[PDB]
Amino acid sequence: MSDGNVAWILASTALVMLMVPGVGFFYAGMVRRKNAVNMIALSFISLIITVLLWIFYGYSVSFGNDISGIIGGLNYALLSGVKGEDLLFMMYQMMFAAVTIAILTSAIAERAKVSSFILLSALWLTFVYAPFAHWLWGGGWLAKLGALDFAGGMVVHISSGFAALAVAMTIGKRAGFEEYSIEPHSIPLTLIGAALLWFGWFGFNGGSALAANDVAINAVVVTNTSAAVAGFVWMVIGWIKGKPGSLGIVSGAIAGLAAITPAAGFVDVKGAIVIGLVAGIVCYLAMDFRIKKKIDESLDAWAIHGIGGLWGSVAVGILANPEVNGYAGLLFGNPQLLVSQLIAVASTTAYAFLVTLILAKAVDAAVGLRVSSQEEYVGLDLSQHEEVAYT
Amino acid sequence: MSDGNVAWILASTALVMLMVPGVGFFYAGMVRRKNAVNMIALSFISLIITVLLWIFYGYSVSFGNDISGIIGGLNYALLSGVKGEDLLFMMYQMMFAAVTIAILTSAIAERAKVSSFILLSALWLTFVYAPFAHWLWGGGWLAKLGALDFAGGMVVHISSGFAALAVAMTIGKRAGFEEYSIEPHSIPLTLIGAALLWFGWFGFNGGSALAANDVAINAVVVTNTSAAVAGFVWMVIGWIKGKPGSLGIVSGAIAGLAAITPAAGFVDVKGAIVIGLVAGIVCYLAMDFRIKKKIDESLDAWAIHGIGGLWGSVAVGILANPEVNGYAGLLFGNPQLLVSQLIAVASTTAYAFLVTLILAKAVDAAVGLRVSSQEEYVGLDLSQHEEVAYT
Amino acid sequence: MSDGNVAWILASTALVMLMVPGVGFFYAGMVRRKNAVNMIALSFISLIITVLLWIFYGYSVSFGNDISGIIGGLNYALLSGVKGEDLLFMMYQMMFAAVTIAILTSAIAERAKVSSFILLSALWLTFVYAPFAHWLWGGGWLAKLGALDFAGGMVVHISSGFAALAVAMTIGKRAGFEEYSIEPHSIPLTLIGAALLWFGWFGFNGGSALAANDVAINAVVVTNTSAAVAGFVWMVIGWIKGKPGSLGIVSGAIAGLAAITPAAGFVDVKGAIVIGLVAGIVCYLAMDFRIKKKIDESLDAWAIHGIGGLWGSVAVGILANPEVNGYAGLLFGNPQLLVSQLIAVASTTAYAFLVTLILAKAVDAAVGLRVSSQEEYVGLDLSQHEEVAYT
Ligand SMILES: [Xe]
Ligand SMILES: [Xe]
Ligand SMILES: [Xe]
Ligand SMILES: [Xe]
Ligand SMILES: [Xe]
Ligand SMILES: [Xe]
Ligand SMILES: [Xe]
Ligand SMILES: [Xe]
Ligand SMILES: [Xe]
Ligand SMILES: [Xe]
Ligand SMILES: [Xe]
Ligand SMILES: [Xe]
Ligand SMILES: [Xe]
Ligand SMILES: [Xe]
Ligand SMILES: [Xe]
Ligand SMILES: [Xe]
Ligand SMILES: [Xe]
Ligand SMILES: [Xe]
Ligand SMILES: [Xe]
Ligand SMILES: [Xe]
Ligand SMILES: [Xe]
Ligand SMILES: [Xe]
Ligand SMILES: [Xe]
Ligand SMILES: [Xe]
Ligand SMILES: [Xe]
Ligand SMILES: [Xe]
Ligand SMILES: [Xe]
Ligand SMILES: [Xe]
Ligand SMILES: [Xe]
Ligand SMILES: [Xe]
Ligand SMILES: [Xe]
Ligand SMILES: [Xe]
Ligand SMILES: [Xe]
Ligand SMILES: [Xe]
Ligand SMILES: [Xe]
Ligand SMILES: [Xe]
Ligand SMILES: [Xe]
């Protein structure tokens, strides 16, 4: 119970929900005007399909009775037997799933069939997210190995980042991706999405303590810290490479946010500083590398969330401070934690990429992921929604 | 008291406030570029005029000493004698009134005099809202008959929906409403308003428990449920009728949100599913019907809130689950609740429509509701605000 | 401790953070399309540089051990020795600093070097904000004289308002400021920023009680009151002077918000009414005066926050109601409070203006504040960020 604790998590749940459309705007501003509605619409659909699957069985498969430590049962299907605290928990977690699917839409920007997205999205929820959530937070085998993930560096960031990479590769580059660079139609729209993501992350990392306590407070402090540091890094890089674009600055902060998520509740401020410092560097390099290889993993869910989540989940095993939340990492005389994290990160990264790959091809073969080239031409707002963003 | 309870309601109050401009954006994106500022401006004015009337006497007339069970006294004028908890309550409720007036602006889109709006708006607050709030939440006669309305299916949705229909009919169609269909100038702007409405509804329905407790938690769960279901319905309908526009999807979710509001704290998840399922269907049919009849109830406050609120208030008498919050409906061996709801819905729907009708004509006759046709031509941003939305 | 209290402040911190980009949007909509990204980007950078300086030493210099009652020590550098409650406090306050720097960007709209801004901004934080925060909230000499500032009428509004005036004068008018009046490129964008500022102020004033208690509740009530009153005033003025623009309406509300901030937790509703009534009048006159004198203090941080904060800080000494929060002003038989406020307002206004003036010239001489005239021509989005707002 604890009224303050329910108050805070009630709030945190509202805050994470906001992050879903928040992703839609963040992404929409980066795509062409002819796909603006589609990019946002996608985040909204993600929310809708997630709520339904989560209640239906998604929540159960994640936190229901464990089987072979890799998945939960159906004892909670249609929330059968979920009450009081569990209901709030079920809800808070529901929102984590939704955001994950939204981040994912990075890989299909400007060229996917909504129906295929819904289909692939529902399957990914079932065979990738639910499993991960269970492995780490539902008493799964990874939790058993002693792995940790405070707010979802793996469950959310690694999964979407790598799943997005696989999907990007499966669906193929956007027409002209190579010959010409696509221009953002509304940076301000993206910045509005960015502001909503920073604001909502308070509930994300800070709500992960499941109580208005000291852990949450620490999570909030380090979360803002890692974010500022990584934002500063991309600002210096941008300057060093020419001019400090705003897109670079917010993408830098987001990298810092993703990296700190798995560790928000275990590390101290100084650790938050290195986590963010490194995240800015690696994610940026990751972005350049993915770009160099000509992969159209469009809005860098991979380079930023995939990579940012990976480093952070690992950094947890290095910097976990017993002083902060009991746990300790290598730096604090505990080699084991690092091993558990390495194992965890290894498994989750490989699974997310390979299984997503399978799923994409499966759906692609079964129904086809991409829209016709002419639809891609006139834009998905018109072709997939029969709508027009602006007039 | 209870710090957690005050914390949560403090938050819920901020969340409902956000919904007012949230309505302005939601609507603004649906009107032409020449009326964008006006559509938003209206929601802002609604907030301002409401705060002032509420404190002045609005709050008192709603929750002050009852007279003949149909209205409250002036014992709270200028909040005379309102302290501690009451102050917080007074505030939370103030925000409910504001949102109501904002939804209402649906019926006057692109052709009303701000001054007339303020006037009509202030009168509606006095003779429609305050009464309704008192009847149901201020110990009025409807409460006596045993009627219920958890978060405002009647007090807020039915009232605005039907009052909007009356006003729409009084003010007349927009020039060209018939010959040509008006196009939204910025769907993304509307989606931003939509995201703000979903997010704020957490405080709306979830804050209606007046405590960070299990009822609130249930309200939050079912609220998201009804919303997802109804959003899914309009998505299928849209697909079935062609393409799934984003406007249809969010209007579907909103229908689900309005329908669940009166019941958020009394029904279970399965009930939330039927409430949303049905809401999507009826509101959509209502929209088509209002359209068929050529009524320019512009942004479907009526079809969506009016109808969505009506069904939901009734559904309360059918699905109220004793298990959930003590109360039971027909389905749970209690025919009475249904009768109280039917009576309640009957009275509130008829009053809102007829009294609003009177008020509109009165103001129209006294000062005139509509702008000149040339002002309608150049747009109200320019003619009513001497401003220009975009450059 | 108190879970509800931590819950509420956790929320309030997220809410104040939102206000930073909220300022960016509010301002961005008022500048030309070619500077939109820059105006927003600035608010984001403010956040980033503040978080870093605050932790680094900013927080310590403000609330660390006092020396000669005018500044704090370094006992908290890198948050050395800051834990539990202090951490939350440190965070909440961090956000106050960030917002302050953002408001400030009013004076440099459309013509400053980001690098110079960062530099000047970091120096201002150190020698103006930290001092003020310490003087009033860190047990500084002003607190000793018995001065009060509930949510920052002086620490935040007076400081930014006057510092903005000085900077405006130092950097010089925008090319063409005189011959032609600059037009807002997106009023709706500004209104989105305005809605975010009203919403976040709940955490600002309401969170300043540092507990989900009666003071917070009162702060929230009066905050909404002063805001509505001042918004109404500018609405009447606008009408009286022609048409009620939306920009005028929100600027009016903001004036009311700034004026009530220093008093949010000490006055009653009736006092909130006069504070807002007067604020609307003075700030408007201040705006006209600053305009008359041809000063390009661009987005009226001065006329609105500077002046609004000044009046409010003074009004505190006149209306403080013992009934409300123990303290009493002149009107309540206590001449002393007024004197402490007058002294406080006198010192803070003079310091902010003169020291900022020094700092501006210093940086200007050291590196130069303004961009080349050609950069000003093509716009800072392109020249300072190598980006383009819309396509
Ligand atoms: Xe994102
Ligand atoms: Xe999903
Ligand atoms: Xe699922
Ligand atoms: Xe929980
Ligand atoms: Xe897809
Ligand atoms: Xe996907
Ligand atoms: Xe961000
Ligand atoms: Xe931000
Ligand atoms: Xe928001
Ligand atoms: Xe995210
Ligand atoms: Xe955060
Ligand atoms: Xe890659
Ligand atoms: Xe609405
Ligand atoms: Xe009103
Ligand atoms: Xe009223
Ligand atoms: Xe309350
Ligand atoms: Xe009107
Ligand atoms: Xe109205
Ligand atoms: Xe919505
Ligand atoms: Xe949404
Ligand atoms: Xe609404
Ligand atoms: Xe909700
Ligand atoms: Xe109708
Ligand atoms: Xe809260
Ligand atoms: Xe919140
Ligand atoms: Xe501002
Ligand atoms: Xe700063
Ligand atoms: Xe600082
Ligand atoms: Xe605090
Ligand atoms: Xe500057
Ligand atoms: Xe500055
Ligand atoms: Xe927003
Ligand atoms: Xe505002
Ligand atoms: Xe607002
Ligand atoms: Xe502000
Ligand atoms: Xe507020
Ligand atoms: Xe001035």
From Swiss-Prot, chains A, B, C:
Record-marked site positions (Twin-His motif. Important for optimum substrate conductance): 157, 305
Segments passing through the bilayer: 8-27, 39-57, 90-106, 114-137, 153-170, 189-208, 218-237, 246-263, 269-287, 301-319, 338-363
Pfam families, A to Z: Ammonium_transp (PF00909)
Extracellular topological segments: 1-7, 58-89, 138-152, 209-217, 264-268, 320-337
Entry keyword Membrane: yes
InterPro entries: Ammonium/urea_transptr (IPR029020), Ammonium_transpt (IPR001905), NH4_transpt_AmtB-like_dom (IPR024041)
SUPFAM superfamilies tied to this protein: Ammonium transporter
An annotated GO cellular component: plasma membrane
Any one GO molecular function term: ammonium channel activity
Membrane topology: Multi-pass membrane protein
Localization of this protein: Cell membrane
Entry's family note: Belongs to the ammonia transporter channel (TC 1.A.11.2) family.
Function: Involved in the uptake of ammonium/ammonia (NH(4)(+)/NH(3)). Transport is electrogenic. Transport the ammonium and methylammonium cation with high specificity.
Subunit structure: Homotrimer.
Protein name: Ammonium transporter Amt1
Gene source species: Archaeoglobus fulgidus (strain ATCC 49558 / DSM 4304 / JCM 9628 / NBRC 100126 / VC-16)
GN (gene name): amt1
